[PDB]
Design a protein around this ligand. Structure first.
Ligand SMILES: *[C@@H]1O[C@H](CO)[C@@H](O)[C@H](O)[C@H]1NC(C)=O
Ligand SMILES: *[C@@H]1O[C@H](CO)[C@@H](O)[C@H](O)[C@H]1NC(C)=O
Ligand SMILES: *[C@@H]1O[C@H](CO)[C@@H](O)[C@H](O)[C@H]1NC(C)=O
Ligand SMILES: *[C@@H]1O[C@H](CO)[C@@H](O)[C@H](O)[C@H]1NC(C)=O
Ligand SMILES: *[C@@H]1O[C@H](CO)[C@@H](O)[C@H](O)[C@H]1NC(C)=O
Lengths: 163, 314, 163, 163
C-alpha cells in the first residue's frame, strides 16, 4: 500500500480488487481469497481482544462512608497505579495491534501482488504504481483466469517473449 | 548502481526481542539516570519546613512556630524535623500526615473555649523558647494552684464553615501518679470526645517513662475531621490538652520528604529524598518512591531505545 | 539490510543513499523520501513514547518515621509488584520497539529497493549485494532521474532488451 | 510459507532446504545459513524470555491464621489485580512472540527465496509453488553451488536467454 498512488473508492464488496482497462472495456472486480484471509485474521484478533474478564473483583472501598484514611490512601494509590498500568497497557496494545493490522493489510496486499507476479512469468510486468502490463489480448477470459487463480502462462509465452 | 544505507564506526548496543545487545547506528534514552540534587520547583508555592515537621504545624512546638499556619502548593519535610516539643506520639499518624500533605496549607481559627476559675497556661521545661511554656494552639489545663480536684468540663465547638475542619487534642499520661495528682488531682480521669462520626473515648494512664527531651510524661495527640455543620463535644474530667485553635484545610498540594535545599531554577514534576526527577522520559531509575506526575520506576539500570537503523560497519 | 553486505560510512546526511560508480565518475548521493519517511515514523514513535504521565501520585509511605509494620509490608509489597511489572513492561517495550525500528528500517530499505527495481523494468537488474547492473550508457542525468523518482524507462528499452 | 502448498515432511536435520528433481535424479538437501540464523534468533528470544526474576517477594498474607478482614481483603484485591495484569501480559507476550516467530520463519523463508532469485538472474524463475525452473543443464555441481552461495551465473547466461 506504499507504492500505490491511491486506493479505489468503487471497491465495495471486496477489500482487494482488480481493474482491467483492456480492449474489451473497463471492469472493476473484487478478489475473494485475500480479503477473506485478511478479514479472518483481523476478526480473530478482535475475538481474542473482545473478551470480558473472568476474574471477579469485589468492593474494596466505600463511596458513602469513607474508610480509614491510611488504608483509604493505600487503596486509592493501589487503584491509581493499577489504573495507570492498565491505561498504559491498553494504549500500547491498541497502538501495536493497529500497527499489526496495517502491516497485515500491507502483507496481504503485496502477497496478492507477488502471487500475481508468480502467475505471470513474462507475459506481464509491474509499472511501480500497482498495475501490470499484459502483453497478450484475451476477451475477458484471462482476466478472470488471473482472478480465479487458474492461469496458465506456458500457452501465452510465445507471443509475449518478443514484445 | 549500488544501493545501500548509512553506518557509523561506533554505534550503540540495544536490546531486541530476538537478540540482546545488537548494534545500531543511533539510540536514545528511556530510563533517566541523571538526578537533580535540588528541589527546584519554580512556578508553584513551596514551604521548606526544615527543622520543623509537617505535623508540628498543627500543635505548634517552638521549631514549628514559623510554619504554624501556611499556604503552599508543595510541602517539603526533612528528617531533622521534629513534630513534638513535649514527647508523645500521634494516633493515626500517617493518616494525619497524608491529610496535611493534601491540605494546601492550614488555617488556625479559635474555638472560643472559655475556662472558668482554672489555670490554663501550660509550662514545660522541654517546650521552651525563653522560659517554661507549651505549644502554640494547645492549652495544657492544669489545676488551680496545687493538688486539687479538676471539675468536669463539657466544651462544645461547632464547625460553621463550608470546608471540613481538623481538630487535634492531647492526652497527658504523667510520669507518675503523684505528678498527675499534682497537675489535675486525684480520681480516675476519664475523657470522651463526641461527634456525629466520632465517639471514641479514652483514659489517661500515668506511669514511669524514659526521659525523652528531658521529660517523663507523654502527651498523645488524637485527631478528627469535622464535616460542615457538625460539632464536637469534649467532656473531660481532667488531664486534657485542650485545642485552643482548630485547623482548617486550604486547598490541594502534595507533600515530599527530601533532604536537599530548595531553589526555583526548574519546572519540576516529581520529587523525592534525593531531589527532583526532571525529565520527559517514560521511565526512571533514581528512586522508587518519587511522587508526582513523572517517569515510573524500573529495575533495570538502563534501556536504549533504537532510534537509528541496525548498522553494520564497512 | 539483509542482502546488503555492509552499510556505507561516507553517507552522512541521509539514511538511505545511492552509489552509481558509472563511467562519468564516482559519487555517493542520498535519497530524501525514504529517509524522511523513516525519520518521521521513528520520531512519531518517540513522541508517542517520550511522554510524561498526566496522573499525579502522592506519598503513601514515610521515609523518616516508619509506618505500621503490617501496612508498611503491604505498601512495600504493592510497590515492589508495581515496580516489577513496570520493569517488565519497560523492557518488553524497549525490546519490541527496537525490533520494530529495525524492521521498519529494513522495510524502508526494501521499499526503496523495490521501487528502484520497479523504475528499472529490464534496463537494470538486481545483483544480490544491493546493487543494480545497467544495460545502457547514460551520463548522470539518468542517475538523478532515478534519484528524483522521475525515470523514463520507455526510451531505454530498445538497446537494453537484447542485453 | 505463503505460496508453498505444503511443507516437506522428509526434512529432519535443518529447517529450510532444497529439492532437486534434476536429470541426475531426485534428492533432498538442507540449507544451513538461514536455519542457523532463524534458530539463533528464536533461541535468543527464548533466552531473553526464559529468565527467573531478580525481584524477591515476601509473604504478605497468612494461610493458617487469617489476617484482619479489611487489610486481608486489600491484600487479596491487590493480588487479584496483579494476577489479572500478569495473566494479560502473559497472553499478550505469548501471542505477540508467537506471531513474531511465525513472521520470522516466513521472513527467513522469504530472505532465502529472494537470495536464490538474486543468485540466478534469468537462469531460473519462480512458478508460484516455491520452486525455481532451471533453464540450464548441470549435474549437481551448480545446485550445490547455489547452496554454497558460490553460484557463477555469468558463465550460464548465453544458453538461458534464448530459452
Ligand atoms: C479514591 O478514589 C475515588 C475515585 O475512584 C475518590 O472518589 C475518593 O475520594 C478517593 N479517596 C481519597 C481518600 O482521596
Ligand atoms: C542520535 O540520537 C540522539 C538522541 O539522544 C540525538 O540527540 C542525536 O541528535 C542523534 N544523532 C543523529 C546523527 O541522528
Ligand atoms: C448549615 O447551617 C446553616 C445555618 O443554619 C445553613 O444556612 C446551611 O444551609 C447549613 N448547611 C448544611 C449543609 O446543612
Ligand atoms: C519499603 O521500600 C523502601 C524503598 O522503596 C525502603 O526504604 C523501606 O525500608 C521498605 N520498607 C520495609 C518495611 O522494608
Ligand atoms: C485471599 O486469597 C487466598 C488465595 O490466593 C485465599 O485462600 C484467601 O481465602 C483469600 N482471602 C479472602 C479474605 O478471601
Amino acid at each position: 500500500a506504499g507504492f500505490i498512488e491511491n486506493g479505489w473508492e468503487g471497491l465495495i464488496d471486496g477489500w482487494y480488487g482488480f481493474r482491467h482497462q483492456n480492449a474489451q472495456g473497463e471492469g472493476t472486480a473484487a478478489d475473494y481469497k485475500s480479503t477473506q484471509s485478511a478479514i479472518d485474521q483481523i476478526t480473530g484478533k478482535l475475538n481474542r481482544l473482545i473478551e470480558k474478564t473472568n476474574q471477579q473483583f469485589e468492593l474494596i472501598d466505600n463511596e458513602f462512608t469513607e474508610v480509614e484514611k491510611q488504608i483509604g490512601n493505600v487503596i486509592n494509590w493501589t487503584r491509581d497505579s493499577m489504573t495507570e498500568v492498565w491505561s498504559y497497557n491498553a494504549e500500547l496494545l491498541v497502538a501495536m495491534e493497529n500497527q499489526h493490522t496495517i502491516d497485515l493489510a500491507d502483507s496481504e496486499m503485496n502477497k496478492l501482488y507477488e502471487r500475481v507476479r508468480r502467475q505471470l512469468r513474462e507475459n506481464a510486468e509491474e509499472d511501480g504504481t500497482g498495475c501490470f502490463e499484459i502483453f497478450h489480448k484475451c476477451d475477458d477470459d484471462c482476466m478472470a483466469s488471473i482472478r480465479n487463480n487458474t492461469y496458465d502462462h506456458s500457452k501465452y509465452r510465445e507471443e509475449a517473449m518478443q514484445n | 548502481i549500488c544501493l545501500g544505507h548509512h553506518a557509523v564506526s561506533n554505534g550503540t548496543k540495544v536490546n531486541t526481542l530476538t537478540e540482546r545487545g545488537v548494534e545500531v547506528v543511533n539510540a536514545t534514552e528511556t530510563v533517566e539516570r541523571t538526578n537533580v540534587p535540588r528541589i527546584c520547583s519554580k512556578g508553584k508555592r513551596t514551604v521548606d519546613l526544615g527543622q520543623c515537621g509537617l505535623l508540628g504545624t498543627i500543635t505548634g512546638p517552638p521549631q514549628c512556630d514559623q510554619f504554624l499556619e501556611f499556604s503552599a502548593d508543595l510541602i517539603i519535610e526533612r528528617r531533622e524535623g521534629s513534630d513534638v516539643c513535649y514527647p508523645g506520639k500521634f494516633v493515626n499518624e500517617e493518616a494525619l500526615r497524608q491529610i496535611l500533605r493534601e491540605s494546601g496549607g492550614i488555617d488556625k481559627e479559635t474555638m472560643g473555649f472559655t475556662y472558668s476559675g482554672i489555670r490554663t497556661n501550660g509550662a514545660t521545661s522541654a517546650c521552651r523558647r525563653s522560659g517554661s511554656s507549651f505549644y502554640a494552639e494547645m492549652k495544657w489545663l492544669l489545676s488551680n494552684t496545687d493538688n486539687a480536684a479538676f471539675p468536669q468540663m463539657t466544651k462544645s465547638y461547632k464547625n460553621t464553615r463550608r470546608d471540613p475542619a481538623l481538630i487535634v487534642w492531647g492526652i497527658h499520661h504523667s510520669g507518675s501518679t503523684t505528678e498527675q495528682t499534682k497537675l489535675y488531682g486525684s480520681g480516675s480521669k476519664l475523657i470522651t470526645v463526641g461527634s456525629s462520626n466520632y465517639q471514641q473515648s479514652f483514659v489517661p494512664s500515668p506511669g514511669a517513662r524514659p526521659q525523652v527531651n528531658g521529660q517523663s510524661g507523654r502527651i498523645d495527640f488524637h485527631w478528627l475531621i469535622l464535616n460542615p455543620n457538625d460539632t464536637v463535644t469534649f467532656s473531660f474530667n481532667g488531664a486534657f490538652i485542650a485545642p485552643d485553635r482548630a485547623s482548617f484545610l486550604r486547598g490541594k498540594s502534595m507533600g515530599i520528604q527530601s533532604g536537599v535545599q530548595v531553589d526555583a531554577n526548574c519546572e519540576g514534576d516529581c520529587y523525592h529524598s534525593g531531589g527532583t526527577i526532571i525529565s520527559n522520559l517514560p521511565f526512571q531509575n533514581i528512586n522508587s518512591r518519587a511522587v508526582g506526575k513523572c517517569p515510573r520506576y524500573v529495575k533495570q539500570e538502563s534501556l536504549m531505545l533504537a532510534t537509528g537503523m541496525k548498522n553494520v560497519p564497512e
